[model samples]
Target chain A: GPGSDLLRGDAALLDAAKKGCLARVQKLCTPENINCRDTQGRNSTPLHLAAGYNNLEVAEYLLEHGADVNAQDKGGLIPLHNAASYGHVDIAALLIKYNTCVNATDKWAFTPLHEAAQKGRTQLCALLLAHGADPTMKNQEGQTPLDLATADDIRALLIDAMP
Target chain B: SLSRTPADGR
Candidate 1:
């Protein structure tokens, strides 16, 4: 129980964010602790976990409290990456409103478009496309977002999004 | 083995 409460400093904040515990996150997160990464080697920020969890409220709170919307984890993935990875359009929209880079590439050079397409997130892919996400961009494997498309609807969406 | 962890895997 103590370990759960004392979730290793920044990791604690990340845990709260992942759980969408708005109250706990609001109470424990400080400006200095907001951007701190976990020791798990991903080096994720609280915003990343919140984005992954699709916890829009916590995401807004973190952003308002000075969390860097574009802060990258160790893999060069930003909060948008997490949002796209899970097809969280609301979270993605929030990150975009905060000026998160729509076309940011990770270590593999995979953009949010790529992530969304791979996950068959048609709506998020469409949203990212509307937000100026580049579908032409390729990853380390040279696969464009269109190439990553698995869902028929998502493939059609990416096809339409291609320049 | 220094395998890929969740952080690096993402």
Candidate 2:
């Protein structure tokens, strides 16, 4: 019951995740509260907050304890989407290892590949490609991953992967 | 060691 207060609301778990307080997160991972989301309209799970804050260790712990790898926030962004958006390549890899949909699109139709390209995360783009991310997939703007690529190296890699 | 901002802003 030490972290029981953390089991009820978004602030406790979300803050622990954002701050990478792994021990607190671990202590709060009780069956009665592991998957609880935040405010009514926010819908951010602990894993989502961890991934957004680039807390790979916390993300791994959450995953190991049965956090939904593909649970989307209200914005339709999954943990993989947050990892890719933040260019957390290791976290992205770990999510992939857990069988997350590497090509899953958000509400805007942007896949992890598109986010990596937009952020010029060349290494992440390469990894996503190797994991079967489609280079030609279009976002809501109709821009392919290549079209969103801002770095020369990222652009080159996307071009090379194109059919 | 220089702490460089990551390519993607955190």
Candidate 3:
């Protein structure tokens, strides 16, 4: 797979993603070609860049066209995991739709719910809850999503979303 | 295809 594209995404795609340039970036990705990984870090793909930039449209386009929604970066972080940590709720939704496991965790065993809670994204926490994300799911640190809910508001949101 | 917040679909 010398030229087979182990990773597909570049700076242009990242820029396009940040700008929300759906059509332009899609053109660059067409037939889903923009999925190329960058010339940097673990060969991060366009979806990886989009997740980094919080670009909903770009991420969606990539997913719709068959980008690996569960694909991980060099850090073993999936897009769902990254978006959760970064508080990118919209991107998180797209990842889930593409069938990213709600309980999918990284090396730490912390699910996306844990990261969203850690980031204090209440809405995301609520969303995850509705989708069956186990707030009690623990990680390497032995902390669950509830454990990550440091903020009172997040706690409240989780309570409300749950009951 | 699923229900969640604004960012879950990525």
Best by TM-score: 1
Please write out the lDDT profile of model 1 over residues A1-163, one tens digit for every residue: 7656556656768889888899999889877788888657578888888898788899999999999999989878898988888888899999999999999988888898888888777889999989898889988888999887878898888777776
Root-mean-square deviation (CA) per prediction? 3.9, 6.0, 6.8
Residue B10 error, candidate 2, Å? 1.6
Model 3: per-residue Cα lDDT at residue A81: 72
Q: lDDT, candidate 2, residue A3? A: 68
Per-residue lDDT for A4-120 in model 3, tens only? Answer: 342334456655765678976766665545555554554566676677678888788888777787776555567777677677878878788788888887656768887789778
TM-score of each: 0.88, 0.86, 0.75
Interface RMSD of each: 5.4, 9.5, 9.8
lDDT of 3 at A75: 51
Model 1's alpha-carbon lDDT is 0.83
lDDT of 1 by residue, B1-10 (tens): 1231232212
lDDT of 2 by residue, A75-132 (tens): 6778887778788888899999999999998777888898889887888888999999
DockQ of each: 0.15, 0.11, 0.04
Residue A136's lDDT in candidate 2: 91
